[PDB]
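Homework-ish question, so no full write-ups if that breaks the rules, but can someone show me the predicted structure for this set?
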Amino acid sequence: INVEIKKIMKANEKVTSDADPMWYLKYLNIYVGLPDVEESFNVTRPVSPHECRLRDMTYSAPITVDIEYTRGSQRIIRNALPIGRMPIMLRSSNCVLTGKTPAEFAKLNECPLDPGGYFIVKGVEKVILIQEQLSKNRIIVEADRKGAVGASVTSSTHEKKSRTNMAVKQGRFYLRHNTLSEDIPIVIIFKAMGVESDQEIVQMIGTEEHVMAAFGPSLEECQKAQIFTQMQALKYIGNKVRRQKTKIEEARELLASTILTHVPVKEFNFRAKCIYTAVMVRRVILAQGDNKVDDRDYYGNKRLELAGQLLSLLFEDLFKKFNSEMKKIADQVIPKQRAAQFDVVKHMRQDQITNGMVNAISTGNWSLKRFKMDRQGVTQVLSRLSYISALGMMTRISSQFEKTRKVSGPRSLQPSQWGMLCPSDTPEGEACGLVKNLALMTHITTDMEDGPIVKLASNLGVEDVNLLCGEELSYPNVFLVFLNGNILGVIRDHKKLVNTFRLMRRAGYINEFVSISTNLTDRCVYISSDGGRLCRPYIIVKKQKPAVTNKHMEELAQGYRNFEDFLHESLVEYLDVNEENDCNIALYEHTINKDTTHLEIEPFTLLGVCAGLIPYPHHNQSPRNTYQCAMGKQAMGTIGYNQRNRIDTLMYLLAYPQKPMVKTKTIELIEFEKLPAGQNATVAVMSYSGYDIEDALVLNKASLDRGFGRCLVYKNAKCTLKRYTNQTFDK
Amino acid sequence: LPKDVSVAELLRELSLTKEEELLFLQLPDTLPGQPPTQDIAENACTLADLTEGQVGKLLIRKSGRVQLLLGKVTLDVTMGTACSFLQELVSVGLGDSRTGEMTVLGHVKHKLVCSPDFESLLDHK
Amino acid sequence: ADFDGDEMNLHLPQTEEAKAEALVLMGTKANLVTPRNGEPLIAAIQDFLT
Amino acid sequence: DDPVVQEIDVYLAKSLAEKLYLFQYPVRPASMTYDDIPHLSAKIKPKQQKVELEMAIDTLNPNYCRSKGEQIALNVDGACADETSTYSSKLMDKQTFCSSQTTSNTSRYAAALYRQGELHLTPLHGILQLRPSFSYLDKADAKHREREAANEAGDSSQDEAEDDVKQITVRFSRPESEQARQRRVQSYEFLQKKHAEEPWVHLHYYGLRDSRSEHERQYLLCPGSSGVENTELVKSPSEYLMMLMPPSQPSNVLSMAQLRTLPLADQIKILMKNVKVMPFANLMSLLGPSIDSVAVLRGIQKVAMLVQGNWVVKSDILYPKDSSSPHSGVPAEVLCRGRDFVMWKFTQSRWVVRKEVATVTKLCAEDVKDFLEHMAVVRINKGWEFILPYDGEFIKKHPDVVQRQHMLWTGIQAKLEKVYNL
Amino acid sequence: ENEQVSRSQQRGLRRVRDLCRVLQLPPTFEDTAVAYYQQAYRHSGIRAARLQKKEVLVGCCVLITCRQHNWPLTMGAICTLLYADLDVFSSTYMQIVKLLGLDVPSLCLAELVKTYCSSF
Amino acid sequence: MLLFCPGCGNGLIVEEGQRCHRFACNTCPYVHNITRKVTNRKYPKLKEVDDVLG
Amino acid sequence: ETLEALILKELSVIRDHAGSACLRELDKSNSPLTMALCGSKGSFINISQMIACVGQQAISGSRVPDGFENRSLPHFEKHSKLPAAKGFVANSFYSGLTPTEFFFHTMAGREGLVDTAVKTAETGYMQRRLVKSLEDLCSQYDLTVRSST
Amino acid sequence: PGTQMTLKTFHFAGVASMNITLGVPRIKEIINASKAISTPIITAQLDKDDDADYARLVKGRIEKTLLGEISEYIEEVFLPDDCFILVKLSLERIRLLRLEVNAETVRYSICTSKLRVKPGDVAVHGEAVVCVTPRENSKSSMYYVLQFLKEDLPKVVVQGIPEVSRAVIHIDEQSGKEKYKLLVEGDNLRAVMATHGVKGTRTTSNNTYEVEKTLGIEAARTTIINEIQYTMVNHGMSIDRRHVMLLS
Amino acid sequence: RMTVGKLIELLAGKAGVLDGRFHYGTAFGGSKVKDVCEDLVRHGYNYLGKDYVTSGITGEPLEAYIYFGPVYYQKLKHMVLDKMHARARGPRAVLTRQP
RNA sequence: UGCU
Ligand SMILES: *[C@@]1(O)[C@@H](COP(=O)(O)OP(=O)(O)OP(=O)(O)O)O[C@@H](n2cnc3c(=O)[nH]c(N)nc32)[C@@H]1O
Ligand SMILES: [Mg+2]
Ligand SMILES: [Zn+2]
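A: Not a homework solution, just the prediction itself:
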């Protein structure tokens, strides 16, 4: 709501119609304002989230904008005009709950301990779960359906997303794209992309004897045909192009823009794309031998899209639709209406964006036609069974699979989930392994500018890929460097590069969230700066001694410094999955050896919120912990200090709730002791009367009479008395 | 062919033999200097702004360290990508607007890369 | 079953012939063994064996 | 590791700064060179550098197929047309090498000529990769197309005069939309036409074996003394770092660096609001030794009070006039009065009773607990004790400050006795 | 229904809905406005009328729907957003109210006061 | 092995001329007559003696 | 694979010896021991796991695979095939499990859970097909099993 | 029992290799009676079950052996007179593996479903030398087909059944005597029984379709019953044989 | 089920309610068994939780000691009053006349 | 969405 909405407005700032030139509609600045209610007669009034829940309305703010247009060639400007209503998230920057003391929360009828972060539409509380998908712009080498080891790459830019594959079904590399009638050999594409010398193609592919032996069939198949020039290759591609020299132009356009959109071309210069496809073919050849097949379940190649990105995409789509509708209305009204000059203000729909947002948040189905994205189950009703239930549901993660196949791969617990997601917290049932919860200590990165990163990489001696041929890619000491899937260049002695980059990041000249990883099997150094990556703080260890000391901890306890000071003083740093793949971490101080780079802050942070309630979980079994989390997601207890004024369709409360005697540090952090969901009872483990055969228990009549286990069930019955079209009303 | 190092390369080029050699070095984008009366701004300072004469020194310390003292700062020089294809250095001088002269100065065999010593630049202040 | 929240169904026949067939064929005393291998399934359980 | 030997000097040359190009052959190994291959001409352009070399190859050598040469010559050219022929004779004699541009800017690249005890650096005006181009095949394809057209026209022995008068098919110069105009501008044909619009320049080739090569090779050197102190290149490491990395543009939100970048008064105010208990020596150590002690004393005397040698932040600094109690909602004035009473009790006696403070101030248990925890700790069988010990060093060093704080505390005690009726 | 409707009546209905959505009136107000517009269109005198006549008919139907629920809305802003002049607006309003005879609740003073005070 | 034309760089195929077998290019008149024996061994991995199981 | 098998054999021998030692040192009247002897619930394997030492965490009949590059977790060295680095659990449930051992145990538990989840649907479909195919046969009075036709 | 089975692993039947699908997937494959099954197993007995030499001999006879797996080097030599491919057979490895394959057998194996190579193209010069000289077929093929030959020649079968992929020697160490048997991961029981030295009277196979096509419907029924019983016993659960008999 | 953690939690809770403290069950740490055993032996209770208990039905002591202690039990929303169902003839569906 |  602060930066992305402004960027979208700037991208779609100007809209104009083809007919009647010199007419335009220019957007200057968009505002969201404070949450207001349209109940009063054309009057705004501050409304509280509790009031919205009671009245079954939406907690949104009026979206306003200042615009300038030309009615009759005379420029007329508007300083404030509403265009829609954006549902405001609770405890946000513009929310009324933020910056409030518990006294003000009580005055506004809201619980101070409420996690917030959820939307209120039509009285129901909806939460946008975190979506987990595969990283874009990355080569994936894997077996095909029949078992053919091939490669795939899904190039996704801000406009289009195209997946192109490469197969070795008949010993030669055939490239497959959705815009081609039939898969064509890779050598023809090489010849079409400028590089026509077979010697240069082979040097780019590789100089190894096995590489040449494997690539020989492709050269033979290419030489069988009469394709030897760029013109002939482009003609062949155009002949193979599906309907949407003209064929040559279409083939060149597809090769430049459609195929491998993430690889940019300066001015029809396919050198970078040629190097990219050569590296892809080299990786395929290397994988065709030793079965070093990459796995999809490796979370180092996963991205988490928070509600912000989804809302940004939805707002962009809705704004584009509104601009198209306004342009159509202008084209239909201006030329044949009357001498009365037409202006947009008379047709500026103020309910389109509001209804779109309300439907997308309530129904949960998102259908973006501009991106061809049809998702379901994005929003879910916030479970108010207990405070623990709400806090655990707020930090859930849904997967892109959404119960397509019982693969058991993504459902299994991968070692990459260390410190990021709770291993034991998972719903028991059909959704086991697909719905996960974040760990107690973790973070999700955002998008950076990538400017200083490129500048530092260029200054650190990274040689331009266009300066040298592809033969240098086959050397053992020459390591490729990639930047968000794009080939940044080559480098030698990557140890110095990685050390200098890490030192600069610790100093602060580079954003601490930019991850750097090195894979020696492929000799590739990846520099990740996109958002959605999972990171975890770690204490830096140098020469068998951590940087953090007792003096620093005492200063933190007294208040001299904070976590930001620790980050700035090169004491604690954020590590990504790909970075910890290469870095060494120590669990405790006694485990620190000579080959250690980082130290674990706390081991108990591995568990999630729901698992943090388990007392001594390392003494129990994993299914026991899973069932305990599942039942704690339904445990009965108090919800908040406003549970009496809160009116829900179903609520369960406890008469005499008591905080646990054996409470965990996680419990103290989440303040669950203030809102417990159970009672401590003098339990005796024994067999009595044979009424506790299989997992059953025997209760005491006197204990139940004296108030033990007393529960209250609150149900809501709602009725509406609406007025119909005719002047009549229900009474 | 074992991978050579810059110190040994210079040693065998100067002591073992005396024949001149053409080298190609990649300097950083911005040099530690200011464009002398070039109408500015903290912009990039390349060799096109510097004048002739002594601009820096090449030092070779023990353990194989090769440094370049270009003023108050000291860069480090390392061996670049070992190019094996033909590289011919030529000067194309367009003395006349209608006819020019292409002069082959020599051949390029080795490549060097100069990088700032960011560790020293950080530990200095 | 394990007595940990299982919901089981109970049906009442509406015909004397159906009632007799259920009592005879589906009798608990007559179905003490499984047809798979003849092993008895209705026997002692935890808290009884001990 | 000291520079024992090899103290080579570096010189700079600007004679061939704009006339030095780097041509490299990705398909020709360094072993075989073009020194023995006779060149003919080279086509180049000043802007948008793209050089095309035209060389000559031998024919009498055993590594040439004369029959295939005749075949390719007859395919690319006509029988005896010879008006626009890619080869003078009926054999493939000329070879075409086309240049591809690596990067737009080559200022960071320089050629280093090494001599005995000195290294001369010369900037490069351009770097191009030379590869064997295939344009004779395209010309042969065009020739085949026109031959097929001629055959289709001459399908009959005698072709009658065709009445194919060109009707006036003058299409509209329709006003192209902005999107379509941008597409046309970005099309490859438009860029190729723009590149072709620039005229070519023909240049002769002078091999390395020629005397002109050694004559011009000396221009890479510069006349100058061995030791000359450069006027430029004298910036400090911090300035160089700032040049090579230019910038982009609870109450503890500000970090240590963001705190230090603020004035001394704001620094002291934020430190007091965060910690609320700190000795003067600790404050000096945190602020830095470069700041004057009198300045720090002046800064702290306005936002803190002296309690048993230690400094405690004032109540109004923690509780602004528009704030309120987060637990009870009482106004900030009552909280300030209670905190002042607590501080006065601590100054009078090191041991303070929570029950007595609550009974006197008429405040709630949570507020009293917060006030006591902000500046004290719990001791068994003794009540609440000040978190820091008695600092007599500062009291002995600054007696006038002690007297000022004593009179201020006397005034505060008078106000408290007037308000609470002690 | 929705098939024995002319393009002019459809354009009038769409204009009614567009103005209702611009003014951010509830769907009940939209339904009442379209119902009143259809009821007025039933008459032939309004059916075969001027373009400005039907535009003012849209405006007056919106005004009647707004008045029927005790909602304040100034005829000045209605004319401003309707592309019409006050003289013809009032003339056609009088003609249509005389032809129909629908209830015309008086504009409450307090509601208009509150609406105008929220403007400042 | 895989051989390339020094002139253009395209792949070379083995053909028979008027005097002896020679390597030749499909895009230029360049040829190369064979003087002595030329071999390209691959040393395929032999099948090891699968020992008894158990 | 030979090294993997030898390490697994050594870990199994250690587990069996620890279980035997625990069973020999435990005195009679012990509730878990009595329950395991009578067979009502539990067994010597579970007793040894919860008292003496937990067994090797086997995933798909093998040690914990290398999730990261050449190692299961970053806390261990690269190309390290040690028991504690590949899944061995030295400590028992009484003494408490280390973070890596607990993570491996959770991996095994989730693998078992997903296996059972797939098995439920697979066997349901198989049983439906089998019954729909075999629901026509019946035993006649002449001791001959005949179909519906 | 489908629910009772947990789909365990590591059940190599005592060989610590040759992963075979057992459990619910195996029961599904059996009840479906697919023509091609996953990991078929053929168990064959030996007339001389105590001689490891004869066991290896019959293993080599039944197992498919490619040319590249026995030849030590294959070189495409272009002599100034002609171009041809020379294959050198490793007689040492041949006699170590006890394979009855010589230059004549290799020559006979060549010219079989290989672009119709005439017998005159292949020749033998030494004891373990094979010279192949192809000719242009005029069907979009020229003398430069030596590359295709190099690609597809090493994968030519010289001895063994093409359907057989891997045959191993299993040993039973009964205290009375240690006997040997053949375990074949192929889909051809008829060839395995027809091979010399294999006691075809006691040969069993896992592929129900092959058993039916080879030994009859009754043999298929018996094989189905035995396989279902073995798969059920592997999980420790027992079923009355009457159920599987009725199913078969 | 190998739920030794439940026994440890019970022992820690008993020690805490005896000594007026709150023990911590932090994962991979927390209060050890030795500390709670020392607390129990100091307060006069058995160091293993098992205490001498007399049967309430027969009034005679039990041959084996019973393991008493405070455990944090939490009630779930699953209620038999809500899960109980009994369907008479009742209504049917319009399309297919079934319940 | 939860439950076995
Ligand atoms: C849940 O997140 C989604 C997922 O439901 P689906 O299984 O995708 O719905 P379906 O594919 O259409 O299943 P079916 O074909 O059997 O009808 O949907 C919500 N949800 C689905 N089903 C239920 C349900 O039965 N009860 C509740 N309370 N929610 C359901 C969930 O949000
Ligand atoms: Mg159950
Ligand atoms: Zn060639």
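Now go work out the reasoning yourself. Hint: Chain H has nine helices and ten strands.
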